[model samples]
Target: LHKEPATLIKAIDGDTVKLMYKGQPMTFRLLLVDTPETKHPKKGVEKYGPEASAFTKKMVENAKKIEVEFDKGQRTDKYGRGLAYIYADGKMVNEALVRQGLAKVAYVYKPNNTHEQHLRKAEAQAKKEKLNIWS
Candidate 1:
């Protein structure tokens, strides 16, 4: 569980973000969550997508410090961005995002799910309460 000091560059979406990792800027597709897309202006906002992005924005914008941790397996996504868990001011915002129902536990890839079980439980509870995406 080694998390290096990182800084938020952009809260791209609930499941995607960019960070300044060890002096270089990098984009990271979060390891195990999917939020609605705040994509094209022509396409319009996906339900809850704006909210999800807002939540992530608030977390990053208000944090005094941030860090990211990479999984043992694939360190990057198919798109070549870093794949890691993002932390804001000591909080594991990936789990926090799911617990709040703003994100779904998707992209459960093999050999890189070090935090799957931990995230799984929170998703289940959010589902139990029918939070956001679970709704």
Candidate 2:
């Protein structure tokens, strides 16, 4: 439920991003959603991975402002990256990614379930539309 303003420096992949938080560079993984893998060392680029990454970059970079809402239930992941819901230009970037079929609902962790229902609905709509990654 806590919110922090941030400036997105880069999209690490479809579901991960780097940003400036508290004047320090930080990275975070989007909550409640998972996009295709652009790189996984062993897996390399999965299907539509680059496209999903490109879509995320465009969405984040074009936003006038960005904010990160930390999950009160779970703040950080095992990798030390923060878990958050990102807002860009007043839109939920995490949901947008799902609605646009660039990502899918990934409710792997129980703590970050604030937007799980909505994300799942978005994924269903995207799958119905056969958009981008859904296709």
Candidate 3:
């Protein structure tokens, strides 16, 4: 994966975001994690989805710096969104969501599984603690 500077434009959900890369708007889905759905046309809001969205919104909004790193696993999904690991003030936003129990480890395709272990560990800890979504 390669890293590039970016500006977060908006958090679409807990694991998806709109960002600016080289002055061009881009959409990215955080690799290796999935949060509940806040608005699924048919399913509606899933439990804890709003909380996850709020956590992500605050994390990106309050970040002094943001960066996006494309995964070696895949560049984009079938939906055409970029796959990446985002960082805010040097901390990985992806891991933070899992660590806080706002997300679950998912879509872990190989090659892009670089941080898979770390994410899984965080999820385990969150589960053990019965944190937020984990509860």
Candidate 4:
């Protein structure tokens, strides 16, 4: 697996991202992780919405390199965007975000079910541990 590192610009949705890969604008999905709805501010916020955004921003800020992983799906979404993971310092940014309850799991159109299960488990653990935003 070749490593393509990029800085996280924004979380487009619970399951998507906006970043610049090799100086090219790209959007992708984080493998095996999900977060709450923080993309559409005009669409309104969720229970822990602000925390979700802050959490993502906090994790990526000052991080010059973000590790990205790809899955066996379309390289790009219907909108012609890339799909991959968001990692920093060898940590799975997406999973960590959900594990910490900063974001909730999202299943968009039921494309990949496996990752949703992972998210559910993380959420359950967050609830049990009473993580930051979970409490």
**Top model by TM-score, which number?**
3
- Candidates' lDDT values, in order? 0.86, 0.86, 0.89, 0.68
- For candidate 3, the per-residue lDDT at 58 reads 95
Against the hidden reference, what TM-scores do the models get?
A: 0.92, 0.93, 0.94, 0.71
Report residue 111 deviation for candidate 3 (angstroms).
1.7
Reference-based TM-score, model 3 = 0.94
lDDT of 3 by residue, 5-62 (tens): 9998988998899999889998888899989878777657888889999988999999
| Model 4: CA > 4 A from native | 8-17, 32-34, 41-43, 108-120
Model 4 per-residue lDDT tens digits across residues 12-126? 5555667878787787766655455555575566666667666666666656678776655555667776766567777767788878877666554444343566667888998
Evaluate candidate 4 by giving its C-alpha RMSD to the native, one decimal: 3.4
Candidate 1 residue runs with Cα over 4 Å from true position: 40-44
- Look at candidate 2 and tell me the lDDT of residue 17: 92
Name the top lDDT candidate: 3
Question: Which model is ahead, 3 or 4, in terms of TM-score?
Answer: 3
- Model 2 misplacement above 4 A: none
Model 4 vs. true fold: TM: 0.71
